[PDB]
Amino acid sequence: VRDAYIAQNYNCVYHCARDAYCNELCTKNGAKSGSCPYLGEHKFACYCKDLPDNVPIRVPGKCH
Ligand SMILES: [Cl-]
């Protein structure tokens, strides 16, 4: 388990404005919770806590 910015194809984050959207997204993917931090390694993106190891996450590289 780990905390991280969840990703969609291909190596892209889920952009957001509200924590509620991210919490729903993260928990539906097996995480404990989720939020929409404004600043961070990836701005305005969903951040999940206690996410299952098999869920795709954002890694170094360009979203495509
Ligand atoms: Cl996903």
What CATH number is attached to the domain comprising 43? 3.30.30.10
Question: Nearest Cα to 32, choosing from 6, 60, 10, 58?
Answer: 6
Q: How many domains in the chain?
A: 1
Method: X-ray
List 33's β-bridge partners, or say none.
Answer: 49
In angstroms, what is the span from residue 37 Cα to ligand 1's centroid?
18
**Spatial CB neighbours of 42, under 8 Å, sequence gap ≥ 6:** 5, 13, 58
* Structural contact between residues 30 and 49, judged by C-beta atoms closer than 8 angstroms: no
Compute the radius of gyration of the chain from its Cα atoms. Answer: 10
In angstroms, what is the span from residue 29 Cα to ligand 1's centroid?
8
**How would you write 19-53 as a 3-class SS string?**
HHHHHHHHHCCCCCEEECCCCCCCCCECEEEEECC
In angstroms, what is the span from residue 26 Cα to ligand 1's centroid?
9
In angstroms, what is the span from residue 62 Cα to ligand 1's centroid?
16
Structure letter (DSSP) for residue 9 = T
What is the extent of the structural domain holding 43?
A: 1-64
Structure tokens at 24: 């729903």
